[PDB]
Amino acid sequence: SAEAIRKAGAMQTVKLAQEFPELLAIEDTTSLSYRWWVHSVLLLEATTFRTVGLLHQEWWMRPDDPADADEKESGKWLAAAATSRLRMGSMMSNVIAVCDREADIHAYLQDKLAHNERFVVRSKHPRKDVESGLYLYDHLKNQPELGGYQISIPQKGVRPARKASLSLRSGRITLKQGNITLNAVLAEEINPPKGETPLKWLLLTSEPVESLAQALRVIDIYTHRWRIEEFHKAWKTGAGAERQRMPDNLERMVSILSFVAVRLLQLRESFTLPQALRAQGLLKEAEHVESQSAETVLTPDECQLLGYLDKGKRKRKEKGSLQWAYMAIARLGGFMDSKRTGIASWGALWEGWEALQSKLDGFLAAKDLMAQ
Amino acid sequence: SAEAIRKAGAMQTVKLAQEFPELLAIEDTTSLSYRWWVHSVLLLEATTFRTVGLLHQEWWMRPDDPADADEKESGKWLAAAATSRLRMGSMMSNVIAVCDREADIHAYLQDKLAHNERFVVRSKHPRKDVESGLYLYDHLKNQPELGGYQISIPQKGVRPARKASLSLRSGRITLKQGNITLNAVLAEEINPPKGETPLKWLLLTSEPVESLAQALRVIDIYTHRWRIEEFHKAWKTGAGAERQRMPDNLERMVSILSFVAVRLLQLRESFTLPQALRAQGLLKEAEHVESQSAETVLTPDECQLLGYLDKGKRKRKEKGSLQWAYMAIARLGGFMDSKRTGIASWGALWEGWEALQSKLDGFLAAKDLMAQ
Numbered sequence: 004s005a006e007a008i009r010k011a012g013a014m015q016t017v018k019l020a021q022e023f024p025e026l027l028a029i030e031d032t033t034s035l036s037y038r039w040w041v042h043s044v045l046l047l048e049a050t051t052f053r054t055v056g057l058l059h060q061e062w063w064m065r066p067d068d069p070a071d072a073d074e075k076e077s078g079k080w081l082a083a084a085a086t087s088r089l090r091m092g093s094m095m096s097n098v099i100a101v102c103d104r105e106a107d108i109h110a111y112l113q114d115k116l117a118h119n120e121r122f123v124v125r126s127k128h129p130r131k132d133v134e135s136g137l138y139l140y141d142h143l144k145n146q147p148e149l150g151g152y153q154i155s156i157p158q159k160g161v162r163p164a165r166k167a168s169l170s171l172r173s174g175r176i177t178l179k180q181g182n183i184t185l186n187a188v189l190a191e192e193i194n195p196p197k198g199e200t201p202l203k204w205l206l207l208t209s210e211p212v213e214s215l216a217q218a219l220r221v222i223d224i225y226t227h228r229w230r231i232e233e234f235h236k237a238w239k240t241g242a243g244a245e246r247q248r249m250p251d252n253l254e255r256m257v258s259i260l261s262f263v264a265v266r267l268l269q270l271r272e273s274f275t276l277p278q279a280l281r282a283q284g285l286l287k288e289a290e291h292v293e294s295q296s297a298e299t300v301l302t303p304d305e306c307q308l309l310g311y312l313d314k315g316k317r318k319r320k321e322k323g324s325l326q327w328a329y330m331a332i333a334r335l336g337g338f339m340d341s342k343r344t345g346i347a348s349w350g351a352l353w354e355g356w357e358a359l360q361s362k363l364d365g366f367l368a369a370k371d372l373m374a375q
Numbered sequence: 376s377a378e379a380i381r382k383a384g385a386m387q388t389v390k391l392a393q394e395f396p397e398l399l400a401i402e403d404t405t406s407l408s409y410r411w412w413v414h415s416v417l418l419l420e421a422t423t424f425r426t427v428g429l430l431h432q433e434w435w436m437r438p439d440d441p442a443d444a445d446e447k448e449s450g451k452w453l454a455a456a457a458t459s460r461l462r463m464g465s466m467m468s469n470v471i472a473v474c475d476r477e478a479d480i481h482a483y484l485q486d487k488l489a490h491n492e493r494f495v496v497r498s499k500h501p502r503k504d505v506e507s508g509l510y511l512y513d514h515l516k517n518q519p520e521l522g523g524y525q526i527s528i529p530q531k532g533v534r535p536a537r538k539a540s541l542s543l544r545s546g547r548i549t550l551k552q553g554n555i556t557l558n559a560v561l562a563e564e565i566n567p568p569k570g571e572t573p574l575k576w577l578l579l580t581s582e583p584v585e586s587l588a589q590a591l592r593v594i595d596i597y598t599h600r601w602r603i604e605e606f607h608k609a610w611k612t613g614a615g616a617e618r619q620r621m622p623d624n625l626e627r628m629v630s631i632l633s634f635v636a637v638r639l640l641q642l643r644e645s646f647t648l649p650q651a652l653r654a655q656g657l658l659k660e661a662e663h664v665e666s667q668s669a670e671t672v673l674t675p676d677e678c679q680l681l682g683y684l685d686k687g688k689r690k691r692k693e694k695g696s697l698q699w700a701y702m703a704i705a706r707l708g709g710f711m712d713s714k715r716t717g718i719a720s721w722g723a724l725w726e727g728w729e730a731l732q733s734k735l736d737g738f739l740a741a742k743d744l745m746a747q
Contacts (some may be wrong), residue, residue, distance in 0.1 A: 362736040364731055365739065369680075
């Protein structure tokens with residue numbers, strides 16, 4: 004069952020991805036534990052940055068020998084990549100693998116390279132320029148400032164986001180590893196808020212970087228790396244609620260939830276996304292993101308039913324909207340909305356969600372008999 | 376809303392009680408608290424001892440001055456009695472108020488007396504025989520043993536019940552209080568299990584007591600006092616689940632749950648009752664108790680729906696039964712049933728129950744539209 008499911012799900016994610024000219028494949032590996040690992044390949048839309056669907060989940064337990072995880076892990080990725088392309092196919096070309104590599108950078112790249120896959124990878128540590136004999140940060144820091152830029156870096160805790168000023172620098176770079184030369188992007192916070200550790204990124208990518216415009220697209224894309232964590236979060240919640248409230252179905256159901264933490268991710272997005280957009284001037288987008296139907300995330304049954312269920316409720320929420328829907332589902336989950344945010348939590352969502360799910364059993368039950 | 380509800384509910388309890396020749400009104404006052412009081416009048420069937428419905432709920436908070444509760448409380452009862460008879464009416468005659476009085480015995484009795492209400496009251500402490508100038512236990516203990524008898528006294532903790540041997544003694548007795556003379560029943564355990572505190576009851580009642588047969592009916596009826604605690608328990612659970620998981624609706628909803636902890640009480644009974652019966656030889660009863668439909672506790676919607684929902688499930692459970700139903704609802708709540716008891720807990724019940732409730736929203740939702 005488990006894997007076969009995935010394939011199915013995946014399939015869905017792929018078919019959905021064709022309807023778009025360019026997309027980003029965000030990926031990370033995580034520690035999901037009970038009271039083993041999961042590398043996930045999440046895909047967004049490269050224009051509205053709206054989540055499209057989860058492309059793949061690499062599951063594996065803890066590398067038995069102590070320090071043998073870093074190897075067991077470092078190949079799970081490959082496996083995935085390997086299986087992403089397999090799934091995606093030729094769309095692959097429309098995909099910019101976004102991520103962070105703490106290790107085996109080399110690999111990833113050679114791997115990405117042989118296949119001529121697009122990407123952006125932020126290099127977590129210090130590597131070396133084999134043609135400058137100079138450190139990345141170094142070589143790169145010696146380049147002439149390409150120009151300034153301000154992005155919106157997230158902030159966690161409770162929480163709005165913090166706008167950060169950036170000083171970019173572009174460059175080509177050859178790693179030691181296998182004499183792999185490629186373009187780097189160096190971004191340093193300018194006047195970082197008080198006490199806040201100054202931002203500083205060193206991205207390597209397939210993508211152009213000659214001009215400030217070119218380097219932004221990179222800095223930007225990257226900036227959209229954090230999305231996967233959310234997925235992760237929305238998941239571990241709707242999960243650690245079912246494993247906080249409930250066999251053989253343990254590694255199974257999660258695989259489900261994964262595809263269920265998506266729709267929620269896409270229900271919250273219906274609202275947040277738009278907001279984000281504006282803040283960056285992009286109106287058309289937001290305008291399209293927010294202007295989504297429900298049919299996008301929902302199901303007629305889930306649509307009709309969630310309709311009756313949530314009757315004397317919408318205000319700003321356009322009728323038949325994803326936005327609406329999200330909201331309904333929030334309420335059903337208990338969206339009081341004190342602080343006036345319109346930003347329901349994962350719990351409420353999962354609630355109203357699972358809830359929207361029960362009543363369904365009803366409706367569906369009737370409907371069936373209603374015939375037979 | 377709150378009280379008006381009760382009245383409604385009550386009404387139901389009354390109308391249901393007419394269909395029976397004799398009934399017992401069990402009553403107790405309880406401490407329901409959050410993280411004030413409730414005297415409840417629960418009614419059973421005096422022949423199968425199957426719960427009929429809750430007759431009344433006396434609600435009141437803590438008597439502000441310290442030791443002023445015992446007075447505030449001691450009149451809440453009256454209030455109830457007063458309001459039970461009001462509700463019941465002439466059926467009153469078919470009712471044997473069963474209970475335990477730690478205080479104001481006198482009152483209760485005078486009260487019961489003036490109205491010519493039937494009853495059995497166990498006198499928790501030592502009062503005095505004003506015509507024997509001898510203590511109850513005393514006077515009574517001087518009487519000749521009327522004969523032996525074995526009943527089934529419950530056992531708590533985790534738990535089957537403990538059969539206890541009894542040595543009865545009958546008698547008339549006049550209290551000091553208002554020169555109130557009435558019949559007493561003295562029951563003492565014979566060879567009580569090891570370490571177990573020996574049983575010993577001193578009941579006062581309207582009922583006959585001359586012959587062993589007459590005294591049993593009393594000892595028996597009484598023995599059916601514990602039922603109210605269950606109600607209480609089934610309630611505080613399905614409650615402290617909704618107050619463990621969730622305003623203005625706090626004192627309201629409970630009043631509901633009260634009428635909802637009944638049906639569950641009646642769903643468990645569908646099984647337990649029968650068992651109890653047999654153990655006491657009474658077959659016809661059990662045979663009728665267990666032979667109940669669902670329509671008794673359920674609703675067509677809840678019946679049909681709980682039907683689909685629980686399809687590939689029954690075995691011993693006769694089709695269309697309360698028993699069935701109970702079981703279904705248990706499962707829906709998660710009745711694994713390891714120890715092989717067929718004795719689901721209050722939690723499972725409340726679960727599958729509340730659950731049976733969600734899906735309903737479905738079904739009912741469809742059904743409505745299905746038309747409109």
